[PDB]
Design a protein around this ligand. Structure first.
Ligand SMILES: NC(=O)c1ccc[n+]([C@@H]2O[C@H](COP(=O)([O-])OP(=O)(O)OC[C@H]3O[C@@H](n4cnc5c(N)ncnc54)[C@H](O)[C@@H]3O)[C@@H](O)[C@H]2O)c1
Ligand SMILES: NC(=O)c1ccc[n+]([C@@H]2O[C@H](COP(=O)([O-])OP(=O)(O)OC[C@H]3O[C@@H](n4cnc5c(N)ncnc54)[C@H](O)[C@@H]3O)[C@@H](O)[C@H]2O)c1
Ligand SMILES: O=c1ccn([C@@H]2O[C@H](COP(=O)(O)OP(=O)(O)O)[C@@H](O)[C@H]2O)c(=O)[nH]1
Ligand SMILES: O=c1ccn([C@@H]2O[C@H](COP(=O)(O)OP(=O)(O)O)[C@@H](O)[C@H]2O)c(=O)[nH]1
Lengths: 341, 335
């Protein structure tokens, strides 16, 4: 009855929130994470938040590149599907440390895919990214549109998608959904869990949260010469909880027989600038964010936001939270957990 | 002093020989997936007095401890990275294998290189990174897009190399896009000796010619070419080898790309006929559908290499097939 899901990277931001939705949705979930960018605390708190559904969560501290540890996981539990969140995701770090990114992201993915194939679990939901749209010629960005990458991190997402496409062409038994996330922000509304990266955050809103509570001295704004309304980059910010719910919608979709290797955007379809996000955070928090204005971050797009039509139609899913809610819940988490777990 | 990955293989072996004859020292790592030690035993002997400057070891590039031991024992001035799987058709059926072997091995290799402060690299890329070209000849700056997993591993590895160079300008990297090497050392003492069922055209032909396979299967006869078969840029392997010596010299003044081809297109049937001319043997053919992932017409622009490496291919098809036959007839079961 109760379907069993392995969640790589499940102790991380998106993963932790999604694990909780899995548990509240009736799923059993086994998490695999090496705590490279997270801690044990997140799943401890997910377990509590999940109440009696907490029983259905197991967790192992395993690197996906550890084939023997991973085979062990797959030998002992019959997984209905895998959600693959595990990886490194900081663009800036990626340009500086490309091999770390190729190593962790591609080697960890290939090893997972081989192990899945060996133990007969060929249902995959992959954490892809709007970065694969590169510098879009046209917005909104549709699943049909041209893909490219502009930095090493983005290439790992692009290359993995391509690998999944080849795996599928090679072997018709695979069912794969490539979810292209836009920019998840916010925290579970209880404020008991949220984003807590190790060391220096590379995403905008956790960096802002950390300036707000006093742990970083300023936000650096990467680019004020964009051809946008305020000169800063425009992106599609989605509530992490809506993004989590999208994963429950993806898992239901794997039962469709037509599914072979399919792409869905998970975004809101609305574009918000960097300064609008900062303004919205200042509103929610009552705090000032000191800004240092700098140049473009190498590889950044100007304007990127989602077409939501395909996900609405085929997944029956649409984001329900606006920016104000995103900032409200982020601040609710951070005010009481200024330095994370 | 040069580390040669996949040096027991076809192109590796010939290149290692040229390295030894040109005064270099060579360490070879190979996991003998599509070769044996025997090839290197013969290069050593063929290399004469220079032979004692060759050393070789059974090592998988994915075996990081084994590969570190190698780098810890010798300071390398450069690496030449030939190791990998290379069959377009195999790759379509077995993508994870190709991604596992080609990418995990390369990534591991590059990390160890950096760890041990050897940041000079020549890489075996491929014309398959041009996918199905919309214009020929294929120029280094023409569009890069693969149509199969093998091609993608090559394309991906190029991109990883660029990123590596961008992250750290101490790296000097040359990406050689080989077209279709064929032939053998003109002595006939070394040549292509793949293990397992051959995948490439000419080792499949040579094995049909000596009784080891019953027929050659021709992959596609409805292409938009003179005789209906796919057209490639076949290049003598000794020419290719010499190109790598020139690449090593070029490293001493970047992440640069160079085609190594002849710039002439030859169809599959023309290659068979050239081989029948050289060998006197008749090759039974079975005509079949297109091989998944195959381009139609691929050939090289030779300008950039000529201009920048002072290198041109000098052997023709006729010399490629003679040398091939010379090796085949004297080593019908290879090594
Ligand atoms: N956050 C975003 O804005 C965004 C946008 C698009 C795509 N994504 C993708 O979503 C996924 C999750 O993102 P997140 O925001 O939750 O990041 P995160 O860093 O919180 O989550 C990643 C998790 O993976 C773990 N991990 C990393 N490498 C691992 C390995 N080799 N073995 C095991 N565990 C490993 C980390 O410790 C962490 O818990 C990533 O793949 C990321 O690329 C994120
Ligand atoms: N037409 C062609 O032959 C052609 C064209 C373009 C590019 N290339 C590339 O040139 C290189 C050499 O081609 P070749 O014709 O000499 O092939 P080959 O199979 O004869 O040589 C490859 C060698 O690599 C070794 N090897 C494979 N995986 C290894 C691993 N993980 N660790 C260590 N050694 C490993 C094999 O055992 C073999 O000796 C390859 O990277 C191939 O993709 C070849
Ligand atoms: O410290 C930071 C982090 C991000 N950004 C900008 O905020 C937007 C969102 O960045 P993030 O890295 O979170 O998302 P991405 O678009 O890279 O997935 C982008 O335009 C970044 O240039 C910024 O100005 N400062
Ligand atoms: O048994 C074979 C092997 C190859 N080929 C064709 O001969 C050419 C050379 O292919 P090969 O595998 O040698 O190299 P590739 O061009 O894929 O690098 C291509 O058109 C192949 O389709 C063929 O018809 N039969």
């Amino acid at each position: 009855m109760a379907k069993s899901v392995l969640v790589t990277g499940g102790a991380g931001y998106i993963g932790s929130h999604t694990v909780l939705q899995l548990l509240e949705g009736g799923y059993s979930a086994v998490v695999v994470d090496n705590y490279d960018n997270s801690s044990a605390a997140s799943l401890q708190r997910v377990k509590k938040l999940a109440g009696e559904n907490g029983n259905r969560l197991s967790f192992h501290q395993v690197d996906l590149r550890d084939r023997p540890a991973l085979e062990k996981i797959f030998s002992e539990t019959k997984f209905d599907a895998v959600i693959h969140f595990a990886g490194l995701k900081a663009v800036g770090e990626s340009v500086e440390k490309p091999l770390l990114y190729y190593n962790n992201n591609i080697v960890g993915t290939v090893t997972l895919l081989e192990v899945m194939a060996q133990y007969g679990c060929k249902n995959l939901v992959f954490s892809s990214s709007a970065t694969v749209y590169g510098w879009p010629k046209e917005v909104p960005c549709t699943e049909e549109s041209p893909i490219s990458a502009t930095n090493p991190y983005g290439r790992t997402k692009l290359f993995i998608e391509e690998i999944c496409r080849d795996v599928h062409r090679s072997d018709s038994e695979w069912k794969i959904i490539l979810l292209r996330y836009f920019n998840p922000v916010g925290a579970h509304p209880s404020g008991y869990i949220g984003e807590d990266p190790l060391g220096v955050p590379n995403n905008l809103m956790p960096y802002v949260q950390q300036v707000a509570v006093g742990r970083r001295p300023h936000l650096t704004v990467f680019g004020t010469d964009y051809k946008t309304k305020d000169g800063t980059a425009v992106r599609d910010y989605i509530h992490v909880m809506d993004l989590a719910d999208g994963h429950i919608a993806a898992l239901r979709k794997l039962d469709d027989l037509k599914i072979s290797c399919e792409v869905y955007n998970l975004g809101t379809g609305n574009g918000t600038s960097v300064l609008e996000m900062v303004a919205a955070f200042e509103k929610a928090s009552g705090k000032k964010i000191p800004l240092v204005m700098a140049g473009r971050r190498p590889g950044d797009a100007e304007v990127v936001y989602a077409s939501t039509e395909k996900a609405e139609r085929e997944l029956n899913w649409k984001a329900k939270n606006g920016i104000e809610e995103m900032c409200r819940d982020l601040w609710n988490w951070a005010s009481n957990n200024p330095y994370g777990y």
